[PDB]
Design a binder for this molecule. Sequence first.
Ligand SMILES: *C(=O)[C@H](CSCc1ccccc1)NC(=O)[C@H](Cc1ccccc1)NC(=O)N1CCOCC1
Length: 217
Amino acid sequence: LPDSVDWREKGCVTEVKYQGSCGACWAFSAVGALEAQLKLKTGKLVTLSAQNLVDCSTEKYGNKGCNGGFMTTAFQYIIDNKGIDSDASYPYKAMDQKCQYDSKYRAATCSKYTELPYGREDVLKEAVANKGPVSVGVDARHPSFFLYRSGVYYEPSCTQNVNHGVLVVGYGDLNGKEYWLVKNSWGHNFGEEGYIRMARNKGNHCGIASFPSYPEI
Ligand SMILES: *C(=O)[C@H](CSCc1ccccc1)NC(=O)[C@H](Cc1ccccc1)NC(=O)N1CCOCC1
């Protein structure tokens, strides 16, 4: 397997988004994963509607809009719905709204999704190298997480009990410190232009490999 991967270099990652005061991290992680598959399958990079997920993948999917949700059930909604709209046609408002999905603006579909084995960083590495960006949950309930600025993030208080959905878009090592390249949804001002490099192969640090999943078109 390659020693380093960065899907941004292959044009498979859209601009970093900003969720604001809405807990839509799960929606952003899910569309981020599908946006990469869309680029790989059609040759075009389009940001997909996180709002579509927030407004439409609700109770039936165990999701609570701005109060939280799951990437896996978001993918199921896209499968059941037979599509998800473009972000351009269905903009993010950081608020719970009525469902306004319209197939006229469908920008992608999802036929299935895959869940990786609990805590296996080696399997996660393979998937990121061979399949593409992977949605994961991390333990971000530590003030050091939002205050992260650069380098490889390591928080001794972290645990494997996850609560924040993000997207792994690569991996590598910074002078010997292995890491996962993670795209967040806290805007361009967070971390390294919207990304955080999290410790890799350090005992499933922050639970990054606890619940990984990726969709396929
Ligand atoms: C992402 O932004 C959120 C935080 S929800 C709490 C909150 C914080 C700040 C403002 C408003 C609300 N997290 C989630 O959406 C997580 C994502 C996730 C996915 C997979 C594994 C771990 C975590 N999901 C949840 O918090 N919930 C899922 C649905 O029931 C409600 C809780």
